[PDB]
């Protein structure tokens, strides 16, 4: 029911200190990318999608019906880059549940490191690093950053 | 080799473009930064370090690259910095060539920069496929 194909991503906006955090999760691996955007608008979300599309083979982006995600400028970026958009209810279990859990875990890590940085965006990037490098499943287990690169490499191969 | 990166700043329309190149694959990441300072370069490095296993960053002697803030980000993330000692200079020349082709298609320079990064990394294996394979086979 939850699409874990190598090209599937879940995106959503979370909030802290009156600021907007655009977060993306590569569903199958748990790898995340986050950015603090000045406004919760299509222009900022489309620029974020353009950057994400340049690194990974993004085939599908699952979002809620938020005005920034359903905007013309996001549709133009997804269409230009060759990405499919799927809209669902905010926090729905099939297409928004993986990003819901990642946002909750991301906020927990930001709260731990917040003291270490002056700006929120810095603490957000420190928390993204900590999340993507954390090792899951036993001592010799792999991290999200290692899982994404392996999932995509074995998908190509 | 799997963790070696090169960083440099190029300029267009009075704006600063911070460009990273994964030497072994030709994969690039670029960002338009408001100022050519340590703060902007350290934030960019913090983002890059979160996706790829960056072991070394090679740069020139530019004040933004030799700053205490960049050193603090590299020390925190566990990255080694090397200064002086032309992969990024060829990538900055190719990136400007692609931006010039697509510049008409976008209003903002940053958008054209990201469109050019997409075109470069997907060209085709492609630079985007080479990085992911180099790192997966390294692991
Ligand atoms: C992991 C980490 C990296 C850099 C800093 C740092 C920051 C941070 O901001 C950015 C540069 C923009 C990343 C911040 O928000 O604290 C600042 C404003 N000045 C500094 C001065 C000296 C040493 C370090 C810094 C803090 C933590
Ligand atoms: C690949 C691509 C995606 C979106 C645009 C786009 C932009 C651009 O900016 C971002 C939204 C921030 C990407 C830009 O700089 O031209 C703007 C300001 N208005 C639009 C209106 C209608 C359709 C598209 C756009 C341009 C290129
Ligand atoms: Mg939402
Ligand atoms: Mg220079």
Automatic annotation (TrEMBL), chain B:
Localization annotation: Host cell membrane; Host cytoplasm; Host nucleus; Virion
GO cellular component terms attached to this protein's record: host cell; host cell cytoplasm; host cell nucleus; host cell plasma membrane; viral nucleocapsid
Recorded GO MF terms: aspartic-type endopeptidase activity; DNA binding; DNA-directed DNA polymerase activity; endonuclease activity; exoribonuclease H activity; lipid binding; RNA stem-loop binding; RNA-directed DNA polymerase activity
GO BP annotations, alphabetical order: DNA integration; DNA recombination; establishment of integrated proviral latency; proteolysis; symbiont entry into host cell; symbiont-mediated suppression of host gene expression; viral genome integration into host DNA; viral penetration into host nucleus
Keyword annotations: Aspartyl protease, Capsid protein, DNA integration, DNA recombination, DNA-binding, DNA-directed DNA polymerase, Endonuclease, Eukaryotic host gene expression shutoff by virus, Eukaryotic host translation shutoff by virus, Host cell membrane, Host cytoplasm, Host gene expression shutoff by virus, Host membrane, Host nucleus, Host-virus interaction, Hydrolase, Lipid-binding, Lipoprotein, Magnesium, Membrane, Metal-binding, Multifunctional enzyme, Myristate, Nuclease, Nucleotidyltransferase, Phosphoprotein, Protease, Repeat, RNA-binding, RNA-directed DNA polymerase, Transferase, Viral genome integration, Viral nucleoprotein, Viral penetration into host nucleus, Viral release from host cell, Virion, Virion maturation, Virus entry into host cell, Zinc, Zinc-finger
Source taxon at top rank: Viruses
Limits of the Integrase catalytic domain: 1-135
Main subcellular location of this protein, as a coarse class: host cell
Record carries keyword Nucleotidyltransferase: yes
Entry protein name: Gag-Pol polyprotein
Species, as recorded: Human immunodeficiency virus type 1 (HIV-1)
Part of the intact protein present: 57 to 208 of 288
